[PDB]
Amino acid sequence: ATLDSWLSNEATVARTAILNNIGADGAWVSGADSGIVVASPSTDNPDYFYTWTRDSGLVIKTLVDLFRNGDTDLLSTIEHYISSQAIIQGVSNPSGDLSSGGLGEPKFNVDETAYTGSWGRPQRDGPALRATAMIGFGQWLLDNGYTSAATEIVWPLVRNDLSYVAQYWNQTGYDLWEEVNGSSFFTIAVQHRALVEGSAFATAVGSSCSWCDSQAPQILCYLQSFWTGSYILANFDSSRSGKDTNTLLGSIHTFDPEAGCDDSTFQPCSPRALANHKEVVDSFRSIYTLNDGLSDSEAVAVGRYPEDSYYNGNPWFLCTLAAAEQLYDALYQWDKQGSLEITDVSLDFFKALYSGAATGTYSSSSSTYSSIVSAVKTFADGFVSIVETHAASNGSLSEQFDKSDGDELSARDLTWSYAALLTANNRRNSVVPPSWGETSASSVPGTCAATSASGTYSSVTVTSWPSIVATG
Numbered sequence: 001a002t003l004d005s006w007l008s009n010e011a012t013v014a015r016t017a018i019l020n021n022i023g024a025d026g027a028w029v030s031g032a033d034s035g036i037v038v039a040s041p042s043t044d045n046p047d048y049f050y051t052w053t054r055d056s057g058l059v060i061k062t063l064v065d066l067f068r069n070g071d072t073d074l075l076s077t078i079e080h081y082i083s084s085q086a087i088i089q090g091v092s093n094p095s096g097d098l099s100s101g102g103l104g105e106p107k108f109n110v111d112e113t114a115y116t117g118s119w120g121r122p123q124r125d126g127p128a129l130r131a132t133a134m135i136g137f138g139q140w141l142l143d144n145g146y147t148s149a150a151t152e153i154v155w156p157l158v159r160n161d162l163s164y165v166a167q168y169w170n171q172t173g174y175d176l177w178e179e180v181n182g183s184s185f186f187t188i189a190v191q192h193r194a195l196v197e198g199s200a201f202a203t204a205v206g207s208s209c210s211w212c213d214s215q216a217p218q219i220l221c222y223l224q225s226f227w228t229g230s231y232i233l234a235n236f237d238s239s240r241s242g243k244d245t246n247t248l249l250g251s252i253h254t255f256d257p258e259a260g261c262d263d264s265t266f267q268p269c270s271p272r273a274l275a276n277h278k279e280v281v282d283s284f285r286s287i288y289t290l291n292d293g294l295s296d297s298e299a300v301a302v303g304r305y306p307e308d309s310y311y312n313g314n315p316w317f318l319c320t321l322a323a324a325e326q327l328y329d330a331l332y333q334w335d336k337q338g339s340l341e342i343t344d345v346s347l348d349f350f351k352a353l354y355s356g357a358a359t360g361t362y363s364s365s366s367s368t369y370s371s372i373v374s375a376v377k378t379f380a381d382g383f384v385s386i387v388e389t390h391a392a393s394n395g396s397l398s399e400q401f402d403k404s405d406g407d408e409l410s411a412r413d414l415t416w417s418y419a420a421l422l423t424a425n426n427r428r429n430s431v432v433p434p435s436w437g438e439t440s441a442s443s444v445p446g447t448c449a450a451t452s453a454s455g456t457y458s459s460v461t462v463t464s465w466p467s468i469v470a471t472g
């Protein structure tokens, strides 16, 4: 259809736009140092001309996955990013130094200097996201015979971030939206993932991560507290409803293609994540004029949380895309398992799309399965069509689009918007990321403990990169 063709062209635009926003040769961000991912080229109203640890880590993980799938030209970009982080980790900033909390700093200036003004800090998701981005590249290096680069450059950088996560996971901080000082779902979810794949990577390079091992099960134990019985609470210490796309992002960014529909890790197809999907998406149905007249079986424009007032509270391209991505992931999981189960917890999600839905197990050859997957795919594509409808004529994607008229607003050419388009398109095409080991990390301890483990910190100096030749 036109969505299919639009997506193919948009994937090309998205890749180009991301590169334009990375220093020091990116066309839109002159001034940014080598390997520095800039959030948006907007220098004023709003000023997003900074580098955030979260946006950078999410964008680089996307590029690493494209690279591993054959986009070999991205090699230099990834190397520059890793080199830049060896420096950033050691930059003294308002959150502290390398070994005293500095790794939790949310953003830095594009020239690698500290941002010293007031900001919601620290944001503890950053080190976890950066670790996940680097581990993926480290895995490729190991697999392709560049052991020294993996052991001497990547591992030591990752070791710093993993130590930060194990030491401070059980402390409050700001959420991914940089507004709530408390304990956040997305953050705890990505931290659990990071420690698990961090331990595997440490073993692979001939080292160890005892703090990853002792803390991962405890983070998972705590993660269970976020389930309210009807949806996933986005944050503790908040007065809001708790319905927030923060939870959809937590699910899609911790999606493991080898995982079943596991409730303990909130996988995309788990009953808990499906129930949550409907609760979150439904919260935007009556608050945006853009959604007027749409039925419960139709996709709608999705924002961050219903109480949002940032730029008056509007839908976000990356949030609308996350709503579609969780469903593409679920379709993949059901297909791989050869069945789909409907439980009392997820019944409402299914009933809204297929009125004949009833609890039970449906094999992939059954009529019910066929009806449900068709309806889910159409629903998911619906979210992507809304994005297509409001993207600029040349493919530009801003941070937000107007709740009433759909015009683009806030930061223009937002790097994260482009990465979210790339991942949603990939999942739609059944292109999935490497597994992180969820199948051996979904067991919940019988008793949760408020605890931590201190790892180790050491400054890394990147002398040089071996002449890596990527072909495939």
Ligand SMILES: *[C@@H]1O[C@H](CO)[C@@H](O[C@@H]2O[C@H](CO)[C@@H](O[C@@H]3O[C@H](CO[C@H]4O[C@H](CO[C@H]5O[C@H](CO)[C@@H](O)[C@H](O)[C@@H]5O)[C@@H](O)[C@H](O[C@H]5O[C@H](CO)[C@@H](O)[C@H](O)[C@@H]5O)[C@@H]4O)[C@@H](O)[C@H](O[C@H]4O[C@H](CO)[C@@H](O)[C@H](O)[C@@H]4O[C@H]4O[C@H](CO)[C@@H](O)[C@H](O)[C@@H]4O[C@H]4O[C@H](CO)[C@@H](O)[C@H](O)[C@@H]4O)[C@@H]3O)[C@H](O)[C@H]2NC(C)=O)[C@H](O)[C@H]1NC(C)=O
Residues within 6 Å of the ligand: 013, 017, 027, 028, 029, 030, 031, 041, 042, 043, 044, 045, 046, 049, 392, 394, 395, 396, 398, 408, 409, 410, 411, 412, 413
């Ligand atoms: C698809 O097509 C679109 C349309 O062409 C493409 O988007 C355009 O892309 C160009 C870049 O190629 C952007 O140019 C920059 O513009 C800003 C100014 O932007 C503001 O003003 C614009 C014009 O307003 C006037 O005209 C319009 C239309 O007639 C009218 O509506 C308005 O009322 C007014 O009369 C606005 O259009 C623009 O709006 C957009 O952005 C908003 C905020 O993000 C957003 O909310 C809106 O929805 C809208 O999207 C906005 O209000 C210039 O400041 C900027 O200039 C810098 O960069 C150029 C090089 O690109 C350089 O020559 C300049 O010297 C300057 O350099 C500084 O900034 C750079 C980073 O941006 C940095 O690298 C430099 O080192 C330097 O930085 C230093 O100085 C700054 C000083 O503040 C400091 O902060 C730094 O720290 C540092 O010291 C560009 O000229 C267009 O804005 C943009 N247009 C739109 C509509 O988005 C799109 O890219 C295409 N997509 C694809 C995939 O191809």
Ligand SMILES: *[C@@H]1O[C@H](CO)[C@@H](O[C@@H]2O[C@H](CO)[C@@H](O[C@@H]3O[C@H](CO)[C@@H](O)[C@H](O[C@H]4O[C@H](CO)[C@@H](O)[C@H](O)[C@@H]4O[C@H]4O[C@H](CO)[C@@H](O)[C@H](O)[C@@H]4O)[C@@H]3O)[C@H](O)[C@H]2NC(C)=O)[C@H](O)[C@H]1NC(C)=O
Residues within 6 Å of the ligand: 169, 170, 171, 172, 182, 183, 221, 222, 224, 225, 226, 227, 228, 229, 233, 235, 236, 237, 238, 239, 448, 449, 450, 451
């Ligand atoms: C450090 O780790 C320890 C160990 O894991 C953490 O301790 C656990 O903390 C959770 C969260 O506080 C706690 O769960 C609460 O248990 C209470 C009963 O024992 C519940 O009454 C409480 O209810 C809230 O959460 C429900 C979902 O579980 C919601 O349905 C309900 O509406 C409540 O949420 C509202 O109220 C809270 C107030 O707590 C508010 O913050 C929310 O925004 C919302 O308005 C919880 O279920 C566990 O009992 C604790 N476990 C142990 C062993 O002590 C500790 O929190 C961690 N600290 C940090 C900073 O990470």
Ligand SMILES: C[C@H]1O[C@H](O[C@H]2[C@H](O)[C@@H](O)[C@@H](O[C@H]3[C@H](O)[C@@H](O)[C@@H](O)O[C@@H]3CO)O[C@@H]2CO)[C@H](O)[C@@H](O)[C@@H]1N[C@H]1C[C@H](CO)[C@@H](O)[C@H](O)[C@H]1O
Residues within 6 Å of the ligand: 039, 048, 052, 054, 055, 119, 120, 121, 176, 177, 178, 179, 180, 310, 416
């Ligand atoms: C770029 C972010 O801009 C906003 O965040 C600022 C906000 O404007 C400030 O007012 C202040 O917010 C404080 C509240 O005023 C106060 O009531 C209480 O909530 O504490 C907060 C924090 O001190 O600081 C924050 C920054 O911490 C906006 O609200 C954020 O959502 C914006 N973040 C987005 C952009 C960024 C880069 O692309 C993304 O990483 C992030 O996920 C986005 O949400």
Ligand SMILES: *[C@H]1O[C@H](CO)[C@@H](O)[C@H](O)[C@@H]1O
Residues within 6 Å of the ligand: 262, 438, 439, 440, 441, 442, 443
């Ligand atoms: C998640 O991982 C646990 C082990 O930690 C398994 O028991 C479970 O079945 C799922 O694979």
Ligand SMILES: *[C@H]1O[C@H](CO)[C@@H](O)[C@H](O)[C@@H]1O
Residues within 6 Å of the ligand: 217, 440, 441, 443, 444, 445, 446
């Ligand atoms: C599954 O595994 C976890 C550790 O990963 C245990 O804590 C739990 O008790 C169960 O054996």
Ligand SMILES: *[C@H]1O[C@H](CO)[C@@H](O)[C@H](O)[C@@H]1O
Residues within 6 Å of the ligand: 449, 450, 451, 452, 453
């Ligand atoms: C947190 O608590 C655990 C036990 O609950 C310890 O093993 C750890 O050293 C830290 O004190």
Ligand SMILES: *[C@H]1O[C@H](CO)[C@@H](O)[C@H](O)[C@@H]1O
Residues within 6 Å of the ligand: 167, 168, 450, 451, 452, 453, 454
């Ligand atoms: C993490 O925090 C615990 C306290 O909960 C300490 O015991 C540990 O040494 C580390 O600092």
Ligand SMILES: *[C@H]1O[C@H](CO)[C@@H](O)[C@H](O)[C@@H]1O
Residues within 6 Å of the ligand: 099, 167, 453, 454, 455, 456, 457
């Ligand atoms: C936690 O504690 C260890 C020692 O117990 C330190 O090496 C680490 O830097 C952090 O302070």
Ligand SMILES: *[C@H]1O[C@H](CO)[C@@H](O)[C@H](O)[C@@H]1O
Residues within 6 Å of the ligand: 455, 456, 457, 458
């Ligand atoms: C923690 O452990 C690392 C790795 O052994 C040391 O290099 C560091 O100095 C600290 O003692």
Ligand SMILES: *[C@H]1O[C@H](CO)[C@@H](O)[C@H](O)[C@@H]1O
Residues within 6 Å of the ligand: 156, 457, 458, 459, 460, 461
């Ligand atoms: C801690 O570890 C780093 C990484 O190997 C070294 O660069 C530093 O000198 C210290 O031994």
Ligand SMILES: *[C@H]1O[C@H](CO)[C@@H](O)[C@H](O)[C@@H]1O
Residues within 6 Å of the ligand: 086, 087, 088, 089, 090, 091, 098, 458, 459, 460, 461
């Ligand atoms: C590790 O940290 C030191 C400062 O302690 C820096 O000089 C180095 O560049 C790296 O960031």
Ligand SMILES: *[C@H]1O[C@H](CO)[C@@H](O)[C@H](O)[C@@H]1O
Residues within 6 Å of the ligand: 458, 459, 460, 461, 462
């Ligand atoms: C990397 O190594 C250099 C020395 O070669 C240190 O100065 C730096 O702090 C980091 O340990």
Ligand SMILES: *[C@H]1O[C@H](CO)[C@@H](O)[C@H](O)[C@@H]1O
Residues within 6 Å of the ligand: 461, 462, 463, 464
């Ligand atoms: C690259 O190699 C030099 C060799 O002298 C080290 O000093 C530096 O710390 C980095 O590992």
